[PDB]
From a paper:
S1 contains a receptor-binding domain (RBD), an N-terminal domain (NTD), and two subdomains SD1 and SD2. Here, we used nanobodies (single-domain antibodies) as probes to investigate a unique epitope on the [name]-[name]-2 spike protein, located outside the protein’s receptor-binding domain.
To understand how [name] binds to [name].1.5 spike, we determined the cryo-EM structure of [name].1.5 spike complexed with [name]. We found that these differences did not significantly affect the surface electrostatic potential in the neighboring regions of the [name]-binding site. Surprisingly, [name]-Fc effectively neutralized the pseudovirus entry of all three Omicron subvariants.
Numbering used by the authors:
A (entry chain A): 752 to 1047
B (entry chain C): 949 to 1047
C (entry chain B): 949 to 997
D (entry chain C): 211 to 242, 254 to 616, 624 to 673, 685 to 751
E (entry chain B): 408 to 505
F (entry chain O): 1 to 114
Write the structure that this text describes.
Amino acid sequence: YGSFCTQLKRALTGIAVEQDKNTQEVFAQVKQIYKTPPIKYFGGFNFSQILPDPSKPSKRSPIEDLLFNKVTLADAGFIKQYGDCLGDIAARDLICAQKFNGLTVLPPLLTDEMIAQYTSALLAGTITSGWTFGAGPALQIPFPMQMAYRFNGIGVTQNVLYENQKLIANQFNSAIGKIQDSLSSTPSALGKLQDVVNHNAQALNTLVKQLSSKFGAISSVLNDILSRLDPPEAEVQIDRLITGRLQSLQTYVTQQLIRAAEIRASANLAATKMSECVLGQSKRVDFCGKGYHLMS
Amino acid sequence: NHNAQALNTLVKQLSSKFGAISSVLNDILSRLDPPEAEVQIDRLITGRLQSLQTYVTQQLIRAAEIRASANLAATKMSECVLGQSKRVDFCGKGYHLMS
Amino acid sequence: NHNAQALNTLVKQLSSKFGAISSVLNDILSRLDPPEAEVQIDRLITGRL
Amino acid sequence: DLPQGFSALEPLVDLPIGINITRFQTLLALHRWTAGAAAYYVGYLQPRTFLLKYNENGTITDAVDCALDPLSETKCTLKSFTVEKGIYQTSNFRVQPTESIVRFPNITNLCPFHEVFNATTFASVYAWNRKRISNCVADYSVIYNFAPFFAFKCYGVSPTKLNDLCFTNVYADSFVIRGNEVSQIAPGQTGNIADYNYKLPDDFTGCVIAWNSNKLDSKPSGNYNYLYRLFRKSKLKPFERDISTEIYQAGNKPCNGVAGPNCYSPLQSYGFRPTYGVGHQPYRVVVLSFELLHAPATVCGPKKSTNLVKNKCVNFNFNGLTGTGVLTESNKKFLPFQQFGRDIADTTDAVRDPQTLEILDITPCSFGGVSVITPGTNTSNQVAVLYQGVNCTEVQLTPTWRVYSTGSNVFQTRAGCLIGAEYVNNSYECDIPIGAGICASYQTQSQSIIAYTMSLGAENSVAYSNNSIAIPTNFTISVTTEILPVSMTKTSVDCTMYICGDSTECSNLLLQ
Amino acid sequence: PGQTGNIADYNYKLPDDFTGCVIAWNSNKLDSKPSGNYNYLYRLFRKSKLKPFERDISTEIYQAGNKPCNGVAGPNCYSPLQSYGFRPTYGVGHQPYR
Amino acid sequence: QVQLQESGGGLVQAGGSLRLSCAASESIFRMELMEWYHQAPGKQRELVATINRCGSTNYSDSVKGRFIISSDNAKNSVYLQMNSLKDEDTAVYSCHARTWTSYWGRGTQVTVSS
Ligand SMILES: *[C@@H]1O[C@H](CO)[C@@H](O[C@@H]2O[C@H](CO)[C@@H](O)[C@H](O)[C@H]2NC(C)=O)[C@H](O)[C@H]1NC(C)=O
Ligand SMILES: *[C@@H]1O[C@H](CO)[C@@H](O[C@@H]2O[C@H](CO)[C@@H](O)[C@H](O)[C@H]2NC(C)=O)[C@H](O)[C@H]1NC(C)=O
Ligand SMILES: *[C@@H]1O[C@H](CO)[C@@H](O[C@@H]2O[C@H](CO)[C@@H](O)[C@H](O)[C@H]2NC(C)=O)[C@H](O)[C@H]1NC(C)=O
Ligand SMILES: *[C@@H]1O[C@H](CO)[C@@H](O)[C@H](O)[C@H]1NC(C)=O
Ligand SMILES: *[C@@H]1O[C@H](CO)[C@@H](O)[C@H](O)[C@H]1NC(C)=O
Ligand SMILES: *[C@@H]1O[C@H](CO)[C@@H](O)[C@H](O)[C@H]1NC(C)=O
Ligand SMILES: *[C@@H]1O[C@H](CO)[C@@H](O)[C@H](O)[C@H]1NC(C)=O
Ligand SMILES: *[C@@H]1O[C@H](CO)[C@@H](O)[C@H](O)[C@H]1NC(C)=O
Ligand SMILES: *[C@@H]1O[C@H](CO)[C@@H](O)[C@H](O)[C@H]1NC(C)=O
Ligand SMILES: *[C@@H]1O[C@H](CO)[C@@H](O)[C@H](O)[C@H]1NC(C)=O
Ligand SMILES: *[C@@H]1O[C@H](CO)[C@@H](O)[C@H](O)[C@H]1NC(C)=O
């Protein structure tokens, strides 16, 4: 029938490489891993709700823990050992059915611990250095002075902060505190991240279920066709199944290509936001929040 | 490299039988009789149409990606070259001077 | 213009034989026998899909 | 020894021998006798796949075997003689079965096909007989010895494959019809026989056997013992008979039991004579109808039943259902009337043993994918092999080459297990990505091809104090480059030349 | 091509990719006798099926038991060369065909 | 299942002779390389002798004129014929073979009394 399968494999391999490229581009802006000082006192600002928690083995901040627990995952790409499928617990899930038909899920190159380390490095750098660590060597500065200069950036003089430090610190602490409860209470907060998993699972399940159609033949099982018909009268039946399954595979591959393109666009936007709102201050309207931007 | 590979694959697709008895139309026309030839020619026609459709769709997707890249390049030329940019890490690493 | 052209082409595609003896299902179901009509209806179904 | 290099071989002679050959022999010439000595090399060919290279002169100057080592398999897959640095996917690995098992019921009797195919009398078409066959071993190769017909005519199956399948019940219908009405005994047919006397369903699965019987059903005066129905209010439903005899009415007034005007008898007798044309001579017809497997099977051919094995990748044949897999014990609670078990993809996964009423579960044998990690061929010929998504305790395998495990060449990662690489505690930048936080590279000197954990970046820690600042005292001007694609190649394609060429019939076919 | 039976796998076997023609015609007026033609034979027993375009000529006493035949057609010992019985009063399905 | 196993080590007086018999479980006609390494206590391993598929044989400086390496084709094995033993030849000997992945033997002890 030609070389359709080489094309399908090439397309899927390209998408698989593109995903790792997206993650690496987004999360790896800085090439030095900074450490926060042992003593946590930044003029009254409470950063304990975003800095890593050393007590837990995972070394993740409480908000990161809430986000990770809020989004469920279907397949993590780990060792789905054949022994588990053969264990015969009388509960045959969809993963074993997908595995038995030649569809597999590969694991990402960057484990969650590495991403957490990258995020913690970025947070420590932007807390102890300001925005200088994104344009050269990291230069230390006290946090109230950095806040004064960020205030001066938006057209409000410095003396507004130094005479209102306690009130601003309390407001910032309360605003940070309300975020966790807002995330927990809302049921559909993380819908964008869940839709990806749901769509991929639906596509794979539809591809698996497509195997039970006749496509005009006398049976949907090749062994029955081979054992019930003459040697030269079975090709005219097998051809219909082959054509139908090739059509299904082509449809799945095209859909995956389009979805990958959209996700790549989103990843590029996220990388731009990270480079412009985190490593510096932005004067663009409604790009890094609503209002006058200070930091992210 | 990608364009050359696509064209070469499209050319090489012409040597497949697609279930017919031969991949050359002259052999099919000169061996079988007028009424039957069709049941064989239709297979080749369908296969070649499928190959052409696949190639066209792939070209469309690649063209969309290249257009996105070209738009980004035009924006970079308008902002970094014809002026100075205060956007961080848009026109180089560091503080921008010119391009 | 593009949307209208796409819709008009999709409508006009219904007048092609796709290798069958006729492009109207009633003619195929009135001229040929029950067990033979299928080999003709399948071509139209595949083409329209 | 045999010299290095390549030299292709060219054919001379092909002959139509057409005999068994199992052994051969070499002759020698001895002068007279006198002493002598000879030497010769003998090798055995095997079915292989090669990649041969032709130079500009048309001669074969190089070849690559595709089943010698992972590098050669990668070269064959890429269709090239050079491989660049990276990780490629080459093939899959599967476990082949060991033996075969067959399980058939406890059937000893022989099916009674003799009493059907000749009984010196056949029932009329309007009231046809019907015999039910069950609980017997069916031999369809003896049917040819009972009736002088030409060939079968089967719709759902093939005549030569009837000795393997195992059915639930068989039905035989017999009658006598006219010569030109035989073509009406088929699915989707309309005629006097089809819709008034004997109607076949649209999804028929069986065979039709019709043969001429002019020497038994014909008389010089004329046979009048065979009748058929002519008038009927409505068409027949599939597999239905009518026996009732009455006076059909074709008018408004009632017949009142007399065949007067608009009153006829819907039972016309065939007139059979020995001087008629072929299309009018009597034909004896027997239809065999098969019932597929939904209940315990009862009728099928003479296949021996072997022993039952478990926990082994084996081939199975349960009542005509053939496959390969691993059969284990079952915790499923089958109902008494159930015999099979189906899954999401609608394939059998739980079966009931025909001899002992026991349930078995089927699982496909182990399989997986293989990736080859290699540096450039310009550097070295050594590779590492990654079995994807497999606990590295499992590893007749499909690939021809076999791996041998030493103490330290086998490593287990979260993406499978890696053979031919050495693990180290050092952390460098990633070179050849493998899986979850693992990379591989080539060492200077399996000692070569080391696998390590990728390093995020150099460690740092900026001193922070609430009365200290750091101010630069010098600058540096830097110039960097950034590359961006803009446009690609513009191509145009011609339909008629690509699909059909200079042919005219193909273009006419494509026009529609 | 792709047929199974006595003739197909024990006497004459055709390949699955056959490219040719078959010509068969009735010869009842030449190959039939009132007493019965016995000059045409066919093989009945064979250990294994025939490869395409392969013939067999050897005449031997086929063994259907564990004990050796020892050259006598006794118990579980037969002759795998059965003679066609051709008569002019047979049905069409039994008449000889060339 | 193990690729290579060596045998022949023991106690031998100075000036004697010995034979080492590294036997492989795969056809040696595709191994492309058979190497002998010796490690004495206190130092690292050092190359001893090398034989390749074509037939070329190589030795290091402290080898030539003392002992040789050969191989027969009746049984899959590589033989090293230790001759003219001296004190520093006491070491553990290993055999190595690389087709597309290096296979290492267990090694055997060789001690010479002086
Ligand atoms: C910064 O915020 C954290 C969490 O809101 C504070 O930790 C709380 O401390 C009080 C008293 O020390 C405890 O009763 C709470 O249980 C703590 N919260 C949690 C979640 O454990 C922390 O004290 C704040 N920083 C300062 C300087 O007050
Ligand atoms: C800032 O850096 C520049 C370049 O790194 C310094 O200029 C160098 O000075 C040394 C010592 O006089 C010369 O040997 C080099 O040739 C100079 N480099 C160039 C490119 O001219 C400069 O001195 C530094 N600033 C200060 C205040 O020392
Ligand atoms: C291929 O070559 C080997 C050695 O070159 C052959 O030698 C046989 O090796 C086996 C394994 O030890 C012995 O059991 C036989 O007795 C050897 N044959 C002899 C001594 O004549 C052998 O023909 C092949 N070995 C394989 C295929 O493993
Ligand atoms: C190819 O053939 C030409 C003509 O004989 C000859 O000159 C040339 O050397 C050949 N090339 C090779 C590689 O042998
Ligand atoms: C049925 O078969 C034979 C033909 O072989 C037929 O002549 C006869 O009427 C029946 N058999 C017997 C034994 O009567
Ligand atoms: C069965 O009964 C109905 C009811 O009278 C009658 O109309 C019909 O013709 C009969 N036969 C069939 C096949 O329905
Ligand atoms: C079938 O026969 C075998 C052998 O005689 C016996 O072991 C088995 O119990 C029988 N099963 C049934 C259902 O008759
Ligand atoms: C692999 O199998 C071994 C066999 O006992 C087991 O100890 C181990 O936990 C398994 N590992 C994984 C990742 O399945
Ligand atoms: C690499 O790290 C593991 C974990 O501590 C350790 O057990 C292993 O011995 C290390 N490698 C070497 C060569 O020591
Ligand atoms: C920050 O200020 C506090 C005053 O409350 C002082 O105790 C502390 O030492 C200062 N930080 C450093 C690093 O000296
Ligand atoms: C050829 O000979 C072998 C051994 O004598 C035998 O098993 C086989 O049936 C014969 N015929 C064919 C077609 O192989």
